[PDB]
Design a protein around this ligand. Structure first.
Ligand code: HEC
Length: 103
């Protein structure tokens, strides 16, 4: 993945619902600061679905790549309404940016 191309994808497809920065708001979905290594459902002050909280995974390159292909198939019942990034390369750029931007 390339970080700069992942930032482009993030602003195009994600940023209307999420922030990445430390101390950032919960815009529509939860703020993503500290994502990598965290269990699901952990951002303070956000109300998640029981589907998200019960998924039983830790967010890392591997589980993000899977989730971002098709969110509703990975977490049935999630309130994140997004069809997914189907191209692997674009997903890899995005996860490279998220890793860079959220710690
Ligand atoms: C608004 C229409 C959203 C878009 C577009 C994207 N996301 Fe999202 N996301 C949204 C909500 C409402 C939620 C909460 C889901 C729930 O069931 O409670 C989320 C959640 C995530 C998560 C999980 C966060 C964690 O468990 O703490 C991630 C990793 C995430 N979203 C990533 C993400 C990215 C990278 C997006 C662009 C490709 C994206 N989201 C778009 C709402 C919305």
């Amino acid at each position: 993945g390339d970080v700069a191309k992942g930032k482009k994808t993030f602003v195009q497809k994600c940023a209307q619902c999420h922030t990445v920065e430390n101390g950032g708001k919960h815009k529509v979905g939860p703020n993503l600061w500290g994502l990598f290594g965290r269990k699901t459902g952990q951002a303070e002050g956000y109300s998640y679905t029981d589907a998200n909280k019960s998924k039983g995974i830790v967010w890392n390159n591997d589980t993000l790549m899977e989730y971002l292909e098709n969110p509703k198939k990975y977490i049935p019942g999630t309130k994140m309404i997004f069809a997914g990034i189907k191209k692997k390369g674009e997903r890899q750029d995005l996860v490279a940016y998220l890793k860079s931007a959220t710690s």
